[PDB]
């Protein structure tokens, strides 16, 4: 709510702004790399996401295994990345 | 005799030195000092309206006709301004006035067709025609561009006195 | 240093007469200086020259209102200054 | 000279920090003298509501030993 | 009240982000040696509502296009930048959210849409190719900074933006984590498309190229606030603005300070470099900075346990 | 393979710190006079409340006042 | 006052004023007199200090300075971006290339001068005409669209 | 100029050269 | 057509007419054609109808970036078809201006150059000194740039009294100006990047394709016009021309801020020892008669009517003389029949021959490349288009 009363005062603010705007003045996908790249971004963004419970799993009693995991979890995604720089990956 | 612009160890001391300017940036860094040092100099800018760029007294600028002390017109229409002009602005035809004189009945210059080149003033003998300093004549209207002479001569009183001390300037030179 | 910076500051503010004359000034140059006035044409216009400023900017004239009665006071021209005295503002001539 | 540059500088600032002021007075004038709680689990909030149970319908109010 | 802390913490960074454009327009032209914009009112004070108001007079041209994944566009890129002030944090909040980072990180994802669609509703060839290069290095860009970000939290021990006041009363996070903070630094300057950074919308005119009068101010203003925005966020996650609690407001006056300086130096950065080419730029962030940010990021997990420094949860 | 890390230490100069890095992380632990306390610490941290147990008899458990000098201590966490 | 004759003209003025402190041009740069105006540009004498932006694209661009020669075959297209501004646009002619046909006037491949092909509102002469004419032709186009009226007008339609 | 000698130090310092020698202001 | 698009002739990138069609896949250019005539004008057409004299204009015209170098090789080409040479003091005069304009024209193509890169702020340092330059271009010749002043046979009137000094001060400072933007950009960590290593082109194909300019000298190619045949007293200075390897925008770059430096060298030279003279020939035939003495002497007013009316009259025949611009070699093939208004003048544009090379440099290339390959051409309509 709290929120919510400003997002509104946000939304209305912005759509004031395009109505006096509009009121007062009265095909090629070559680049797979794109794709590629967009690829890439969420196998990371999941990872992130992944990585997001970090900060909560820090306090884990156990630590050793939260470390091991999340050490395993990183180096296995930049090992994905150093693939995709071994073949012409990431080279657009 | 020539100059090589980009004709070209490793050691820890060396690599050091290369891997810290790629990792800190340094030479970036070295660029935002030359523009922060600039900020603090005085700007060279001047107040447009209150403050003039200097012209010195061969500016051509705009076209007049000039006149004899006395007050008769300068030019006695042997139409050679006509001949040099490079882009056939000046358009002059004459007929003896009553006075039995030699005068332009009239001179046409189109300033949207001259390219203000000089050689009017450079070829008029008697110098009727001068390039005045005069360089703000912007126009509303494409027809006040061309000049007649009524326009040119009137330009030529306004701007007289200071036409005269800009030729008193220059003419040793010329 | 600085504060002899800040003492030229007030002198150019207390410079322009009152209060009112120099927000006069800033209004329609937006540069407030002082400088020597060379002289006053017939044409209502003031002209100051100052050594101490660069090139550019050593000269410069304050257009007066209605020099021909055109209401000029916030509608500055270039071509109101005088034949006469536009070479000295321009630096063609250097004796005014 | 680069003078000129702190006016607009100087109205962005005062526009930078009317709302960090702004907000932290607004919330120790609309929680009764003091900073506003912060309930970020559930243990804080309890205490904040069973504060309100507590006495008048505000927790701000915070009745004492004298009570 | 809260309707008036919702005045405050909008105007006035309106207002603020009016003032940045003549403090662009001036500490560029200093840095060139010219006065800049000073003519119009005193000291050019009103030269930021003179063009707004042009902007929004002149006309609105709907190409003969989408017309809502054109308007929805600037609506967009503005609600979501001063959306974003919702939960800063400077002396305490408006909006205090338990995991306000994740908002922040999450709004400013939501942006790049904006640019998507503004480059698909143009329908003209310049804008479709700048939207697609604009959208892959924003994104590229987001990558390597949730990383960034997920390092600092670990040390913060918490998403909350509030926590960090409490754990910068000793010293600011730059200190540690410096070579983050450049790389924050840096991917703040992509984020906000500006110089260094700002392939799209360059000399070649992506997503402004059909957008003139009131769509054009929209994003136009949402892109300074943003470069704020950003800004302060590197002035409450890196730079830690002292606090007091008996005095809240010499945070915000020294957050005011901080962050305007930081505002300064993007501004002092785009006079002073070239741009980068669109793949130099990947180049960068893919090759040059997410090895180095997801190694330092399990540094990061490692630094915190075997120092026997866990962060305190809340 | 000294120039293996000279040269990828003057040119290429981000990966070799990025691996460094990596490893560092992956070493510190292993070896540290205080990697042991992270999970004590957090494990003391009381943050649901500890039920008593019935005192059936000869038990070490602090009765009474939690005070009593039986049962596990922070001084380690003091003074740490 | 609110005799509402009164109020328009303020208004008008207010909406003059904004339109004739932030001129955003954009500059063909056809030719030469394209050099002459990055000088205005540049910083003796700085075209940002009056509120003109030093570029625009044809979008953003309340003004069109024509610098140089409109040769028959970017006459089409010199239409073309003046047709693709907002509703209140205006242009600026620079050069006696453009302003007629220049030096270049009798040739076959030059437009002898664009309001043949553009509506021109400040003829600004001279073969490179001064930069400070330029800054001059621009503050006579501030002064031209200062008398504009246009609200009064509607009032009084 | 009217450098002060301390915006002149920082102008020097920043650049790395003498602009005082240099200047960008043409005088007499 | 992957995606043909054309670059646009208003766009801020390029001299403002290039229609440069690309057939792009995705952010790759396949193939460039550039278009031309733009800026067609019918300068070659026009020259024809008009006398010597008065189509000296024409050439300030034809690439006015460098608007009195230009004028040099008419001057020359007119001088040689007469068999007349300038005074002594007038060709010092011409490679003194001469220089200066080699300055004005790279202060433009550097930074110009920056500008579509993205660089801002080395336009606004340099065009303050470009604007105090062409200040001196005003107190000799009248106009700030097409000055007309370089005329077929000589100067056409001796420096204003107090013109070499301050060519003085100036020079004596430009220098940290050029060392400047040269800690912006010389060794910026980006401007390497976009300019290292575009647009190579080998000796032999610079040779071939008719480069002629800092581009072949940029391959290695080692030519400057100016020391292999000299023109005026080029002969008499001393500088160093400055050669490139790895020819590649970069390098050429650096070539071209080493000229600006090189040119500070010649103008020193041209300040310290220029003639006491004369600064146009004595043929009244040739040079029109000095004003008091065509008021003052029938023969001088016969010539200067004459000579403003009708004309030089050159002897018939036809040259090629080429200069060294400072784009590359600037050439005029004057072909002249007996009368005073010339047959044929074929002007030959260091620009034509670099733009055709567009295509053989930015081959797999992205579309800010092609932006770096025409600033690194100096491209400017004008001589292109003629
Ligand atoms: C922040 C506090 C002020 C800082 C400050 O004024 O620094 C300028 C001061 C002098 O700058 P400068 O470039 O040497 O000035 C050129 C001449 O020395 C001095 O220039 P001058 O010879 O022109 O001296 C006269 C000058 C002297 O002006 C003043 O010193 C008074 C300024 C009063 C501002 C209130 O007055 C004027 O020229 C007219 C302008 C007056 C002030 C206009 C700007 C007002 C800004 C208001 C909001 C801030 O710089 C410093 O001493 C260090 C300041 C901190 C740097 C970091
Ligand atoms: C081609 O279009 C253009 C651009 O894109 C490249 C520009 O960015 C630029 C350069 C950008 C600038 C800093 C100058 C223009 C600045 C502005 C539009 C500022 C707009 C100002 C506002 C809307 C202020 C907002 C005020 C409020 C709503 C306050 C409310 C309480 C220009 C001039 C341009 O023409
Ligand atoms: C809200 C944002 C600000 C809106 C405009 C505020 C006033 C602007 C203004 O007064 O312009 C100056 C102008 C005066 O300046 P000017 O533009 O006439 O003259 C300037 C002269 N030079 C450029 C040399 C400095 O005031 C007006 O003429 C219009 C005022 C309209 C007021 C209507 C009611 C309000
Ligand atoms: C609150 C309303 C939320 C509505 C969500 C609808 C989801 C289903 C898709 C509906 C749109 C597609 C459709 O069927 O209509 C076509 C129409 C097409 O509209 P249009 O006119 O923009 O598309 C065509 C444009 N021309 C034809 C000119 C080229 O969709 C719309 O009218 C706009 C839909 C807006 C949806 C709501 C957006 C809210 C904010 C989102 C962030
Ligand atoms: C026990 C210890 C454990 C920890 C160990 C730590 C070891 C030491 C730290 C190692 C890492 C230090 C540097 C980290 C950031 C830099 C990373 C980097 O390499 O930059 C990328 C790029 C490299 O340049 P380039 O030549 O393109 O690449 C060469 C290799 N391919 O560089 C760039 O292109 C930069 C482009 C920048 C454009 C804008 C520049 C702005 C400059 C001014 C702002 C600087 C930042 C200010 C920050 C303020 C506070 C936030
Ligand atoms: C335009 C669309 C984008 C707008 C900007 C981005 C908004 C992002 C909102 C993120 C979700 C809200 C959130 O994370 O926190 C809300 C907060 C609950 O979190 P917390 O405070 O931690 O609760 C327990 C402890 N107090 O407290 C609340 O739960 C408040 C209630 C939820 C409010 C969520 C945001 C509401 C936005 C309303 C307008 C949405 C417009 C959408 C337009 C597109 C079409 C649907
Ligand atoms: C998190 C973990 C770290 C980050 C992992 C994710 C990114 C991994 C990237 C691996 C890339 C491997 C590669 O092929 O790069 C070669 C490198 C750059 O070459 P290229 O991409 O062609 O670019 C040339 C133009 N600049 O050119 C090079 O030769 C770079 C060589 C880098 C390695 C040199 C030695 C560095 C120190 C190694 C210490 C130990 C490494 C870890 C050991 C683990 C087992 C104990
Ligand atoms: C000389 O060629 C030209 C350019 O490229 C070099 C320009 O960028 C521009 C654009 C520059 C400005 C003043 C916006 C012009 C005018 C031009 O004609
Ligand atoms: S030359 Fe001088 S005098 Fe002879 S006509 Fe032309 S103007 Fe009149
Ligand atoms: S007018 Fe003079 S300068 Fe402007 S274009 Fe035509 S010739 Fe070049």
Redesign the pocket.
Known sequence: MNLYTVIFINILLSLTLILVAFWLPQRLPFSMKFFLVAITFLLFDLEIALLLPLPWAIQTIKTSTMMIMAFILVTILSLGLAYEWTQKGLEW | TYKYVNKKEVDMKSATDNAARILMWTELIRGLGMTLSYLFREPATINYPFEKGPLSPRFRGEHA?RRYPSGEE?????????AICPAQA?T?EAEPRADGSRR?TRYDIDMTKCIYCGF?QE???????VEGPNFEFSTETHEELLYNKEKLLNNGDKWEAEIAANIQADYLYR | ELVEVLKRGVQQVTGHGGLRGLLRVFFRANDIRIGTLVGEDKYGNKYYEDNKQFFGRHRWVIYTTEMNGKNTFWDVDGSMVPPEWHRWLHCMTDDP | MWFEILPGLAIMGVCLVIPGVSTAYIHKFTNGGKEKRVARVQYQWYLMERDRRISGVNRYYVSKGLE | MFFINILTLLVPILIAMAFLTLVERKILGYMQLRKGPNIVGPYGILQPFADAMKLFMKEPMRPLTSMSLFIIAPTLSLTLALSLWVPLPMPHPLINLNLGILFILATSSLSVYSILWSGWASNSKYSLFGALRAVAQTISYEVTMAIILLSVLLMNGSYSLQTLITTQEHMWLLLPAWPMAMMWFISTLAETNRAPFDLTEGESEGFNVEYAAGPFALFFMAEYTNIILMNALTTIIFLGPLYYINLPELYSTNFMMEALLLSSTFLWIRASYPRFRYDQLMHLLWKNFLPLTLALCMWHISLPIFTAGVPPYM | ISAFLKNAWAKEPVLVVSFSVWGLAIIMPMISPYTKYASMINKATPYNYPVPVRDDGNMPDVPSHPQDPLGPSLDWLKNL | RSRAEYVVTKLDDLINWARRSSLWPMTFGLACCAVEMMHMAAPRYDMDRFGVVFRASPRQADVMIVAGTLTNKMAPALRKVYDQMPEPRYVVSMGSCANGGGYYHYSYSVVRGCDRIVPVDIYVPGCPPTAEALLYGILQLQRKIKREQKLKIWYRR | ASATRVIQKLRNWASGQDLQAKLQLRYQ | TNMTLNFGPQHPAAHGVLRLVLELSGEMVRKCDPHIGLLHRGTEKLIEYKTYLQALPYFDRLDYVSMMCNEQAYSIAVEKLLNIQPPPRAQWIRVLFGEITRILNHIMAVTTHALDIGAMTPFFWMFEEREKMFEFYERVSGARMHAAYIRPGGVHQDLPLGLLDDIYEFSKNFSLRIDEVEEMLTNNRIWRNRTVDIGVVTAEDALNYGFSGVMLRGSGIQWDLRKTQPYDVYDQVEFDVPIGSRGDCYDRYLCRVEEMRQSLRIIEQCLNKMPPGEIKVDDAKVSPPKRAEMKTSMESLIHHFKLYTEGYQVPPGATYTAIEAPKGEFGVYLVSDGSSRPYRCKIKAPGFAHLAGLDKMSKGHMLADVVAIIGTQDIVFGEIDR
């Not at chain 2, 300068?74 to 006509?82: T, V």
């Not at chain 2, 070829?123 to 025609?129: G, N, Q, R, S």
């Open positions: 006709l300068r030019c006695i229409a042997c139409k050679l301004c006509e000046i002059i332009t009017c070829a008029c003998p008697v110098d009727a025609i």
